[PDB]
Amino acid sequence: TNLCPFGEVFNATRFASVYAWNRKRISNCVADYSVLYNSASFSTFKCYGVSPTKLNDLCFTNVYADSFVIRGDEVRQIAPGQTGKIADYNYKLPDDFTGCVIAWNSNNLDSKVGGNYNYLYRLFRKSNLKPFERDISTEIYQAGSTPCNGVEGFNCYFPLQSYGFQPTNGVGYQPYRVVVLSFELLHAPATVCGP
C-alpha cells in the first residue's frame, strides 16, 4: 500500500557526478509509473524491454534508480549499445537493458555565473566499463609510452575533468539530471508493483 519513494530520487536536493553515479534500491512498495511518464517536467523518458504505458501492470522483485548529472548532448549515450566518453568510461547500460531512462534540463539549478565546476566526469580510462560498472579511482592516466610516476605531466593526466556549467551555454552543453530505472526479476516474490 505504501508508495515507492520516487520523490526522494527525482526531487533529491543533490545529484552525483556521473563517474560516481548514485544507486538507490526501491523495494516493498507500490509504483505509479504513469504519473511519472505523463509528467511534463521530463525532457527525456525512454523505456527499453517494457512499455511505459504497461509498467503500472507489472510486478518486479526490486527497482534500482541510478542518478547523476551529464551534459545535454550526452543524454543520447545513456541507452543500450551507445559509445562515447560517458557510456565508455562513466555509466554503461547493457545491450539487454530492461528499464527506463529519464532526464530533464537542470540549467536553473546546476549552472551558475562564472561556471559551476562541482560536477565531474571521467575523461580517460584504460578500457571501457562493463554494464553497470562504477569506477571512482583517481590514478594518473598514462596517455603515452613514458611513465607518470604518480603525478600529472607529459602525456600523464588526472583522469577526471569538471563540466563547466554556465547559464549561457547552449542546450547541448547545459546540465541534465538523469534517473535510470532498472527493473529486477529474481526467483523471489515481487515487492514493487503498480497500482
Epitope: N149, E152, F154
Partner: antibody
Framework: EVQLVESGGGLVQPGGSLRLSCAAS????????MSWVRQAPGKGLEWVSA???????YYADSVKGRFTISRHNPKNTLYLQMNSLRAEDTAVYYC?????????????????????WGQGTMVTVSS | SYELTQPASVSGSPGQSITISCTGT?????????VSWYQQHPGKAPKLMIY???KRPSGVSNRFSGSKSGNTASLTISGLQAEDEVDYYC??????????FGGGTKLTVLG
C-alpha cells in the same frame, strides 16, 4: 592563424624580478602543453619550463626555485614569473606549444616537440 | 648547463648528404623515442623539422630524415641547398616531464 606573442622583456638589475607574458591566438593555452625556451645572444636554445594538464609545472635546474610558469585561461595567456634574476638569465625568451599525444596534429604516438613558437622577447639582466 | 652535444659546425656540398649528430646519455636520447630537430634562421624562431626521432611535420621536405643509435641521434639532410645554411638544434625528453636541447650546429653549404 595560430600565433604566440611574447612581451614583458626589458632591463632588470641582478636580484630583480620580471614577468613575461605570451598571448596566444588561434588556439587555447588551456588545452595545450606549453613551454618557455630561452636563447642567450649568439648561443643555443635552453628549455626553461613547461606546464601540462592540471597546471602541473616543471623546470630546468638552472631556474628551479626562481621561476614560475602559469596560465590565465580567460586572457588565453601564458606567463613566466622570474625572480632573483642573474646575469646568466640574459636571453631572448620564447613561449612555445609542446605537442603531446592528444594534440590534433598527432595521428599516433607521443608528440614531444615544440611546433608553434613566438617571436621572443629580450631580457637583459645587468647593473 | 647539461646539454646534448652537437658538432659546432658541419659542411657539405650541394647535391650531397650531410649528417649532424646529437649525443646524449642513456637517460635521455638512449631511453626515449622523443628526439626532435629544429632549423633556425638568424633573428627568427626555430622551426620544427623532425620529431619522435624520424617523423616529419606536414610540409617538411623529405630531404630531412632523423635516426638514433644508442645515445646518439642523427639528422641527415640530402639534396643540400643554399637555403640549408642555417643553425640546427636537437632536443630530447630528459625524463619526468623535462626536455634538453643540444648546443646547435651551423651548417655551411660549400660550392
Amino acid at each position: 592563424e595560430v600565433q604566440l606573442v611574447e612581451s614583458g622583456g626589458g632591463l632588470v638589475q641582478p636580484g630583480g624580478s620580471l614577468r613575461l607574458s605570451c598571448a596566444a591566438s588561434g588556439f587555447t593555452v588551456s588545452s595545450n602543453y606549453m613551454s618557455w625556451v630561452r636563447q642567450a645572444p649568439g648561443k643555443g636554445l635552453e628549455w626553461v619550463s613547461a606546464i601540462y594538464s592540471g597546471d602541473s609545472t616543471y623546470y630546468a635546474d638552472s631556474v628551479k626555485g626562481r621561476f614560475t610558469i602559469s596560465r590565465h585561461n580567460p586572457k588565453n595567456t601564458l606567463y613566466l614569473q622570474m625572480n632573483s634574476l642573474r646575469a646568466e638569465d640574459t636571453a631572448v625568451y620564447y613561449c612555445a606549444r609542446l605537442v603531446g599525444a592528444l594534440t590534433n596534429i598527432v595521428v599516433s604516438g607521443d608528440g614531444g616537440a615544440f611546433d608553434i613558437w613566438g617571436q621572443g622577447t629580450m631580457v637583459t639582466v645587468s647593473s | 648547463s647539461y646539454e646534448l652535444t652537437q658538432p659546432a659546425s658541419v659542411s657539405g656540398s650541394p647535391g650531397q648528404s650531410i649528417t649532424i649528430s646529437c649525443t646524449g646519455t642513456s637517460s635521455d636520447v638512449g631511453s626515449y623515442n622523443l628526439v626532435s630537430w629544429y632549423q633556425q634562421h638568424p633573428g627568427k624562431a626555430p622551426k620544427l623539422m623532425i620529431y619522435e626521432v624520424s617523423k616529419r611535420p606536414s610540409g617538411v621536405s623529405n630531404r630531412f630524415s632523423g635516426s638514433k643509435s644508442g645515445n646518439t641521434a642523427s639528422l641527415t639532410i640530402s639534396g643540400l641547398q643554399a637555403e640549408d645554411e642555417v643553425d640546427y638544434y636537437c632536443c630530447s625528453y630528459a625524463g619526468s616531464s623535462t626536455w634538453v636541447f643540444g648546443g646547435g650546429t651551423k651548417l655551411t653549404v660549400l660550392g
